[PDB]
């Protein structure tokens, strides 16, 4: 805005694992306000990922998210009359949300049948560093490298 710094809203922790990260993940996954189905899908995918990857659902999820987190994004400044595509370091709060959004979109695209199965496969791919989400992040980093010439603008 112009003249408004409104305080952040009250967000409830996840019931199962008490995770604010997981709560935002559920909200991002949710469509049309169907929170129940979204949370069921999240829980199913997390359980499957736990069993396959490691020991704890939260551990596997965190590992994947970190493997997808972006260091740098690009924005479009407009100073010299023309618009410069410049890289810029992304703040910690935005990192998690961007990673989760990318993961969710990739999960939606994938060809597996169940949504839970799609999410589990995408999370595992992210953990293995071969997923569509990490590919998207790496392409963003590649663009940042391309436009690194404007790193002091």
């Amino acid at each position: 805005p112009r003249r408004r710094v409104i305080g952040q809203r009250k967000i409830l922790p996840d019931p199962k694992f008490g995770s604010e990260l997981l709560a935002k993940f559920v909200n991002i996954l949710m469509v049309d306000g169907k929170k129940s189905t979204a949370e069921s899908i999240v829980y199913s995918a997390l359980e499957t990922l736990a069993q396959r990857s490691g020991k704890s659902e939260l551990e596997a999820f965190e590992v994947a998210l970190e493997n997808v987190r972006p260091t740098v994004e690009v924005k479009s400044r407009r100073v010299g009359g023309s618009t410069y595509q410049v890289p810029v370091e992304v703040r910690p709060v935005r990192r998690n949300a961007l990673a989760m959004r990318w993961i969710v979109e990739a999960a939606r695209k994938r060809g597996d049948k169940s949504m839970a199965l799609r999410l589990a496969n995408e999370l595992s791919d992210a953990a293995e560093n071969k997923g569509t989400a990490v590919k998207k992040r790496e392409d963003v980093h590649r663009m940042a490298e391309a436009n690194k010439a404007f790193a002091h603008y």
């Binding site: 690194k148 010439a149 404007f150 790193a151």
Partner: protein, 117 residues
């Protein structure tokens, strides 16, 4: 091939393009590199980062001669004018002299006419 372990870096930095040339203290040129050869074209070749990468490419080129000491002569009003120096320092020569050799006339020849854009 003939190791001398000290060179002079002529950094001709115009507005459009930057040319870095490593030469012996006497004047015989050893190796050179430019943003054009670095691949940047136009608005990207007129940027400091291109100057830095051209400096690095030149440093690699003259690596055969094994020069260690390095005095720098920067000439011309170029966009980088400094990224070349930082690139050389990173490449790992001991920078001995930093000298400006911009040719300023004492009211000599008349410059070309002012642009109406």
């Amino acid at each position: 091939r003939k190791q001398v372990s000290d060179g002079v870096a002529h950094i001709h930095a115009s507005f459009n393009n930057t040319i870095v040339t490593i030469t012996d203290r006497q004047g015989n040129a050893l190796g050179w590199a430019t943003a054009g050869g670095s691949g940047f074209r136009g608005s990207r070749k007129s940027t400091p980062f291109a100057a830095q990468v051209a400096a690095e490419r030149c440093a690699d080129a003259v690596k055969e001669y094994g020069i260690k000491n390095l005095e720098v002569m920067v000439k011309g009003p170029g966009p980088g004018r400094e990224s070349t120096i930082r690139a050389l320092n990173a490449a790992g020569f001991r920078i001995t002299n930093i000298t400006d050799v911009t040719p300023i006339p004492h009211n000599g020849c008349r410059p070309p006419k002012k642009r109406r854009v």
